[PDB]
């Protein structure tokens, strides 16, 4: 069998060059591009790294660049394995929080009052 149970926090290295200690990741929730109202693009945690300089390429004006990562987003399942991926390869990060709104109390019929203020007109 050769099970040999032991314990160590798995920090793997050698596969990148230097950008372990240089950068800091970010875990957050994408929340409702507000030109419309589709809520399908919630429920999945994503990541994005540091943004570095974008200069002008002096022949066209293209957005040529250094900063070799700059485009890496993965699709996470939840907050639980969100941390566990950033530590398993081991570079710094910072975590946001999921925002869910009010439930909330909305009821038609109270928009026509005898003495209240909740009263609509000009419909």
């Amino acid at each position: 069998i050769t099970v040999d149970e032991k314990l160590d926090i798995t920090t793997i290295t050698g596969v990148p060059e230097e950008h372990i200690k240089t950068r800091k990741a970010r875990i957050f929730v994408p929340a409702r591009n507000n030109m419309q109202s589709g809520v399908n693009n919630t429920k999945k945690w994503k990541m994005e790294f540091d943004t570095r300089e974008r200069w002008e390429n002096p022949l066209m004006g293209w957005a040529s660049t250094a900063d070799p990562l700059s485009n890496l987003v993965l699709t996470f399942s939840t907050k639980e394995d969100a941390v566990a991926f950033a530590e398993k390869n081991g570079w710094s990060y910072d975590v946001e929080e999921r925002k869910v709104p009010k439930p909330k109390s909305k009821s038609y019929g109270a928009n026509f009052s005898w003495n209240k203020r909740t009263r609509v007109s000009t419909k």
């Binding site: 069998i1 050769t2 032991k6 160590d8 793997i12």
Partner: protein
């Protein structure tokens, strides 16, 4: 850890293996320097060998070092034969690359904090 190892068990089949192939590199550095027809001094090669082994000495867990053993041994397969046509061996030395500043006042005049 509910996982079986590769070769070693705990640190003592391990640390005798990293010493082991070090001699195989050590007789190789004078052997290839006249073979690949490149011209530096041979002691620079022996400094760069121990450069590579000493840097990764911050490991306190087996089967990662053993994973580097498989990486370290596979390097010798191209090395003892001729599978790196005069470029890959020169790729170890960051030679024509401009020097990184690595100093705070020096970084501040050039760059948006890279």
């Amino acid at each position: 850890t509910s996982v079986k190892p590769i070769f070693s068990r705990d640190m003592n089949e391990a640390k005798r293996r990293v010493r082991e192939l070090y001699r195989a590199w050590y007789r190789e550095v004078p052997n290839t320097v006249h073979l690949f027809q490149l011209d530096i001094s041979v002691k620079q090669g022996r400094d760069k060998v121990r450069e590579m082994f000493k840097k990764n000495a911050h490991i306190t867990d087996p089967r990662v070092v053993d994973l580097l053993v498989i990486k370290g041994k596979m390097e010798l397969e191209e090395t003892i034969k001729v599978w790196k046509q005069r470029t890959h061996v020169m790729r170890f030395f960051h030679e024509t690359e401009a020097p990184r500043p690595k100093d705070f006042l020096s970084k501040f005049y050039v760059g948006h904090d890279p």
